[PDB]
Symmetry: C4
Subunit: 240 residues, 4 copies
């Protein structure tokens, strides 16, 4: 709370500021989708690479300004910590070799979430249910890891593409979970060498599906014992 | 409100009128399904092409009559705006070349919805939930568009059939969303050139599915906080 | 209500009677599953064909007895009308040529439903929800029939195996509904001749899925406005 | 209740005891996942086979101790009966030939459930709903067994890989239930010999899916007539 600090704060917390940031994001969005076309990039190539690092600096300025305003509440606000990390990624130069970092630039279009509250509310409601599932996710991951071990010991010999490695089984088992060609592509070929592989996979499909179903039925039915107690006491409220 | 206007209005708003329109629709339905057979079309070919443009004019007459009756309320009633556009399509002649317009004729069997209230009510209940999802659809589309860009930059070089174009990635990613041969057909071939493509697609499958599930759980659980407040206040109603 | 009529009725409505019928059904079940094996059928072949027509006559006797008891209430009780038709099928001899009728014999194992009330209750609860869906099924079938026509006109020329016939499109479209290899197997081959077939199928997948989801959300949420009014009035019951 | 019995009981029922057991389980978990790598097993091979039978004896000791404490309540506590059977499996030596028993060792990582109450509660909630489904599972299994018989009689001749055996049809039908390449892989090849096989499988897909959906809708809606009566009477509670 000072002279220039508060002058800054009026700009950062302003309508024009976020409007402009969003306005820029949508442009850099169309910019980055047009960068897809070599027809475009052959012609108007530099027009966009410049436009990008114009926007990167603006976003860096904007992040710096928001830090001076928000102090510690910036590095505990997830939506800002995202904007920090998602813009810092775009500041690591292409001079560092690793080819994907020039592609991680595009994640800065996710600012359209953190800077638009309609999206922020949806995103929050989806993350809101994850912590209740963290213990069901835990059992599933242990389930996968136990069956990843067994499959790597049972099938990775005669089938190394699918099971020769704990990870290759993890991927394959996750594909069995999606039911993606689990039978025609995996178990039926496995069965023409190991006749009983169906004893492994048919129960695995049963458990990992039946659990996924109860994960949802838990979410719904347990969400609505609350609406049936928040109502109950507010009906017991008005009966004395 | 006049002499002939009101004479017309009794016909348009009548039971016989809609009954006849529906009666015609069902016939032109069987007409258009029999037009499938060359055995039929070789024999009774003209019997149907005539029958069609008999029905088209009747439907044009009927649309004209309904406009004189309903005035502005016809061009704000969606069910009529449909009948308008769906019959106007059938009036663009096959003399205009574009081959599909002779196939868009069949959409005039969707009149059986707009002209039968039992269907109109179902259709209304399905469209009724879309506006609540428009913001979740928005995030998904941005999600797709961000990952469509990245995939087109990561894989369209060595895999142009699947990712060489922002649209080809959009289609492919939508196929990954359906889980349609996402692993055997796409990611496993991708991995034999790009070993880490699973880091791209396994999370994409996670997010785009987990969101689709919460879209439904939102629809159900939020629909029924209303039945638990419309009930609550009607229980608080009768306790004073 | 007589002398022999009532003597009969004590047997038909008895515990031993249904117990024996069920006891027989389970045996003819194992009989018919062992008829699968040629190893068995080569050895104990006649032991079962006899056993079957022993049970068929018993079931015919039992149906005749139940008709004399139940009079008109037998030909309006669905569970009996089933037992009637499902045993009458087993009485059409193999002397009539049509090869499948000797296989329709097996449907007489569905008696284990109609004769065991625990199953009858489940079956009733599943059929119970069908009549509410009959109008949503109606729209879907019209939707399929409209898009079956269009696809047969758009693709059956260059793709007769999938679309050359209104039925072949019906089957294919139902396979697109199941998402069974809809892209790799169907639309992607279609697109290498008709580049815009994705404009046909991607919306078709959208509608026919989005409707299937709302069919369930309708079932759940509407079932439980009843439990929230049967409760409400029974709470308004006790507040005067 | 004695001198040494109660000395033992303080150790078994202690925090350190279960903490140590869990601490060991997590190590033997990483041990067994590293046993996947031949690079590891070539080098530090004996380091783990020893470590395993160190843990097996500790778990045997621990099971023996828990039996002396818990007496009959150990052989009626499912979580212990599991630990008993899951460790007894690891005590059958590899000297008995059957190759899989050395792989069933890994199931002793499921102790991390029975020994961690956060997991035990989830597991209990998932098993909790199974007994309500036991009668719906029963009908499905009879449904499968009836259609497994018919398919083995209809298709196992010209298609022995898929239907030549009651079990091969069971597996195939379960794959049709998963919708795993049911059309492209199974029914479409069947139809190019048996043109009407779609009359078999399209209804089978209908029934076995429609039932699976009602299984869930039953679980949800019936779970919440209870929350709407446990609430109702607790609202009728406070209105006298
Ligand atoms: C914050 C970001 C907001 C973004 C809003 C939408 C921006 C749309 C940018 C369109 C860029 C089109 C690029 C393009 O031409 O793609 C390559 C090919 C032709 O390749 P070429 O080599 O020219 O032949 O041509 C195509 O394949 C055309 C593909 C067009 C895809 C359009 C996707 C629209 C997604 C909308 C997302 C909204 C999120 C809220
Ligand atoms: C209701 C619950 C729903 C979620 C259930 C989750 C079950 C467990 C995760 C399964 C996901 C499958 C992951 C997967 O693709 O595994 C591959 C990796 C890497 O192995 P790698 O050998 O590098 O890749 C094989 C392919 N290759 C050779 C061409 C590179 O394999 C590994 O390295 C092991 C992966 C273990 C993942 C554990 C992550 C932390 C806990 C789970 C968090 C999940 C997201 C919320
Ligand atoms: C408002 C519209 C109401 C429509 C009600 C139903 C109308 C049924 C029209 C039947 C047209 C049959 C055409 C036909 O023969 O299809 C071609 C092939 C034989 O080809 P061909 O070249 O003769 O050898 O033969 C087949 O493939 C026969 C296929 C028969 C399919 C029947 C589909 C019934 C759908 C019912 C929809 C009800 C919606 C409420
Ligand atoms: C819970 C949410 C569920 C819905 C999630 C929706 C996610 C976003 C839409 C994904 C649907 C996939 C669309 C698709 O097939 O994309 C293809 C098009 C055209 O690209 P194009 O390169 O012409 O086609 C490739 C194939 N080829 C070369 C043989 C012609 O690609 C494009 O041109 C871009 C398509 C962008 C669609 C944006 C439409 C407006 C917003 C989304 C509305 C969705 C329906 C309610
Ligand atoms: C949320 C999702 C965020 C985005 C995840 C993207 C994951 C991409 C995984 C992947 O493999 O992408 C490709 C890159 C670079 O290719 P790389 O894997 O280096 O192989 C290049 C092979 N070459 C030279 C013969 C063409 O691979 C890498 O550089 C990834 C290394 C980790
Ligand atoms: C009311 C009816 C109640 C039915 C209860 C269960 C009856 C079980 C009958 C078992 C028949 C086994 C026939 C058999 O051996 O199948 C052929 C092949 C060996 O062929 P082969 O040519 O001998 O070599 O061998 C196999 O593939 C053996 C396959 C065994 C399948 C067992 C399926 C049990 C289903 C239980 C259904 C309960 C419904 C409530
Ligand atoms: C939420 C709703 C879920 C249910 C949505 C149902 C949508 C409509 C039914 C779709 C089911 C697909 C039926 C199907 O496989 O169609 C094939 C038939 C026969 O055509 P056909 O050309 O004989 O068979 C082609 C294959 N071939 C040449 C090797 C014999 O094609 C036909 O002949 C036309 C079939 C029209 C079926 C209309 C049946 C009455 C109304 C729907 C009742 C559905 C069950 C409750
Ligand atoms: C109670 C048990 C708790 C277990 C916690 C997690 C234990 C992690 C153990 C990691 C073992 C890695 C073994 C390994 O190197 O796998 C083989 C290949 C390299 O093969 P190589 O022949 O060395 O070349 O390398 C790979 O493929 C590496 C694969 C790494 C997969 C990591 C999976 C983590 C699952 C976490 C489960 C948590 C459950 C609560
Ligand atoms: C809403 C309900 C959801 C659950 C629905 C369950 C429907 C019935 C079970 C279907 C599961 C499919 C089982 C399966 O893979 O069957 C194969 C077995 C063994 O036949 P087999 O000929 O040995 O294996 C064929 C493959 N080969 C030649 C390479 C070895 O086939 C048999 O031997 C017969 C299997 C009968 C299983 C009956 C088990 C007891 C009742 C069901 C319990 C299910 C788990 C809770
Ligand atoms: C509820 C479900 C009830 C059961 C439905 C079963 C549907 C069976 C459909 C089907 O095609 O089954 C096969 C039979 C007989 O074979 P068929 O279709 O006559 O072809 C025999 C060809 N040959 C002589 C060269 C082997 O085909 C027929 O006989 C069916 C005719 C209708
Ligand atoms: C009980 C099951 C886990 C499986 C099991 O049975 N254990 C878990 C997994 C997801 C959890 C819900 C979500 O977190 C959303 C929400 C957060 C609120 O804060 C409290 C209410 C609610 C509905 C949570 C309740 C409960 O915790 C759920 C159903
Ligand atoms: C909250 C979520 C969106 C995800 C998020 O968490 N944000 C959205 C998506 C679909 C929306 C519902 C539908 O519109 C149907 C209906 C319309 C009524 O008018 C008001 C009630 C109801 C149940 C809506 C509530 C809520 O709006 C929902 C669940
Ligand atoms: C409203 C929707 C149809 C789609 C639409 O919005 N129209 C239809 C399809 C299935 C129908 C339910 C089932 O029949 C089961 C049950 C029968 C009882 O008797 C009355 C209650 C209940 C829950 C029915 C309510 C309603 O009728 C449903 C949800
Ligand atoms: C009615 C249907 C079966 C199909 C049919 O309609 N018959 C069966 C299958 C699963 C059963 C539920 C689960 O067991 C969980 C739970 C156990 C409690 O103890 C009582 C409540 C509840 C919700 C059970 C109610 C009912 O029993 C269900 C819905």
């Amino acid at each position: 709370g000072s002279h220039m600090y508060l002058r800054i704060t009026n700009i950062v917390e302003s309508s024009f500021f976020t409007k402009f940031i969003i306005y820029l994001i949508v442009l850099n969005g169309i910019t980055m989708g047009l960068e897809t076309s070599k027809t475009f990039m052959q012609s108007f190539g530099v027009y966009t690479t410049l436009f990008n690092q114009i926007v990167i600096t603006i976003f860096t300025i904007e992040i710096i300004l928001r830090i001076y305003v928000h102090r510690i509440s910036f590095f505990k606000d997830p939506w800002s910590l995202f904007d920090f990390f998602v813009v810092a990624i775009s500041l690591v130069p292409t001079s560092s070799g690793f080819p994907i970092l020039r592609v991680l630039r595009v994640l800065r279009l996710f600012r359209l979430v953190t800077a638009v509250p309609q999206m922020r509310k949806i995103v929050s409601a989806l993350i809101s249910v994850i912590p209740g599932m963290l213990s069901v996710i835990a059992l599933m991951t242990l389930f996968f890891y136990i069956f990843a071990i067994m499959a790597t010991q049972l099938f990775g010999e005669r089938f190394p593409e699918w099971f020769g490695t704990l990870g290759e089984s993890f991927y394959t088992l996750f594909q069995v979970m999606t039911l993606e060609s689990w039978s025609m592509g995996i178990v039926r070929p496995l069965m023409e060498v190991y006749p009983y592989a169906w004893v492994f996979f048919i129960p695995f499909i049963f458990v990992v599906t039946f659990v996924m179903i109860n994960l949802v039925v838990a979410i719904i039915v347990d969400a609505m014992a609350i609406l049936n107690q928040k109502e109950e006491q507010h009906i017991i409220d008005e009966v004395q």
